[PDB]
Structure formats: C-alpha cells, structure tokens
Design a protein around this ligand. Structure first.
Ligand code: CA
Ligand code: CA
Ligand code: CA
Ligand code: CA
Ligand code: CA
Lengths: 140, 140
C-alpha cells in the first residue's frame, strides 16, 4: 500500500524536485499533484464519495485562484476534511506567514531550503516524521 | 532562549521519563509542566498579559478535569492560543483517537512506546522535527 502524498504546488520544477526527492525517501510513497487550491478541493471532493484520501497534504502559500491560506481555511471548515494533516511547504520564512498558517490550523510549516542537498534532506525528514515517527489518520 | 516545551501531565513517572529523554536529546529544551488542561489554560492566560508562550504543547488524552480533546477544543477556540503547536502524546494507538485529535486540530499525534530505547528515540525525533526541521511560531 503506498502512502499517498497530495502536493499542492503551481511551479512544475517544485513538483519535479518533490517526485525526485520522494524516490530517495525509502518510505513507499505515491505523489498526487494539484496545481492550486481549487484542484486540491476538487480532488478531495472525489475522495469523500469515492476511494482513498491522501495520507498527507503539502501546500504552497502563493498559488493562483485558491492560495494556501484559502486552502487551509477550506480544509478546516469542511468536517470531512478537517482531520487531513496539512503542511505548508513554501519559500517564505516570514514569521507572519508561519503564525497565520498555524492560526488557520496547518499541522506544520516547512521552508523550502536554499540548496538542493538541504531540500533532499528536508523531504527525507518530513517523510521519516509524518510516515514513521508520527501517527496520522488512517485512509480506511 | 531555550525552546520551551509545555507538558500537560499529572503522572510523576511520565514527567521523570520526559525529563530523562530531553536530557539525551541533542536540542536545548526547557520543560514547563501543567498538571491538567485547566492549569495549562491558566498558564497560557498569564502568557498573554505576562511573559513568553511555549514553543510547543504536549498533552495526553486522559487527564483529570480538562481532557486532551477538551484542551485542543479550548486552544483552537481562543484566537490568542489557536496558533500554538499542540501534540498529543498518549499510549492509545486507537485510530478513532488519532482521527479525532487531528479533527480537533492537534498539530500531531505520537504514541508513547513501551521500551525505554524507543521512547528516547521518539523524543529525539519529536524535538529534531518541531525544533529543527519545521518552522513553528516565534514566542519571544
Ligand atoms: Ca507558488
Ligand atoms: Ca483566491
Ligand atoms: Ca493546529
Ligand atoms: Ca490541522
Ligand atoms: Ca500521562
């Protein structure tokens, strides 16, 4: 059974980097992609009625149509989505951005680091924590 | 500034185990203790008017007076506390407990292991993630 990670990201290069970094993780992962918060809510809408939710959502803040703050609001307002772990992964390290993400009930916040090496290491640590150390809701 | 961890815990043996595990953790931590959900909310009330919020709150589900689910509800209902990272640390591995913790906007859920080796490791990974890998709200 792969663990399903829903990545919400508008920039193709960030998706490519995530898919390459997940290959190095040594936790069996399947990447789902939404290009903005509107695609993410449509994908989650289908998961309700249909088959499996993602185990984890990673979202960027600055995305067209439905941005990350708007997606966090919508996740926490929907009683069928409120339990989904939602982690911000974004290039902003602005304290005001991190406080607001946490106030909108993001589970965690990760700054995209400044080297490829540190990005690969971040994805290894994200996956070791959320998919190894921590318990997360079952997709069942 | 040490990183301040607020443990909501009445059991002296669990406080001893946490103190012992944090000694071995590579990360400079200061442990604050509240004996139940009601002491925790009073300490946080004083943080508003007075000095610093904790960087992270660790709570169990089964606690006298104000249980963990009720403490999470009270943290998220108070706009001055909603942003505080709150992690359930409990011996329950019931999937319905983990789903409910996440639905009430706990940031994470950690199952207390049954061996000293795995407990020390759990606390090392908790602290490396929340106080190293992740960004959390600043306290000052
Ligand atoms: Ca973006
Ligand atoms: Ca918008
Ligand atoms: Ca939260
Ligand atoms: Ca959440
Ligand atoms: Ca306890």
């Amino acid at each position: 059974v792969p663990l399903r990670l829903l990545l919400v990201e508008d920039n193709a290069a960030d998706i490519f980097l995530m898919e390459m970094a997940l290959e190095y993780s040594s936790v069996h992962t399947e990447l789902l992609v939404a290009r903005d918060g509107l695609e993410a809510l449509e994908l989650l809408e289908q998961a309700k009625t249909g088959g499996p939710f993602p185990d984890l959502i990673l979202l960027d803040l600055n995305m067209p149509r439905v941005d990350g703050f708007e997606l966090l609001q919508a996740l926490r307002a929907d009683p069928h989505l409120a339990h989904l772990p939602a982690i911000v992964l974004t290039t902003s390290n602005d304290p005001s951005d991190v406080k607001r993400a946490y106030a909108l009930q993001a589970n965690s916040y990760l700054t995209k680091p400044s080297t490829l090496e540190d990005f690969l290491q971040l994805i290894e640590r994200l996956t070791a924590y959320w998919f190894g150390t921590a318990a997360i809701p079952q997709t069942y």
